[PDB]
């Protein structure tokens, strides 16, 4: 369940990131 372009998985999105994909408890793929 990685994330893709090199983002990560959070309830939110890395700083500067969007929202995408799909990840555990609530957390999606932000990829940047």
Not at 3 to 21: A, H, L, S, T, V
Request: glycine share 12%; net charge positive; charged share 40%.
């Amino acid at each position: 369940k990685k994330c893709w372009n090199g983002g990560r998985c959070r309830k939110k999105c890395k700083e500067n990131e969007k929202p995408i994909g799909y990840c555990r408890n609530g957390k999606k793929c932000c990829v940047n």
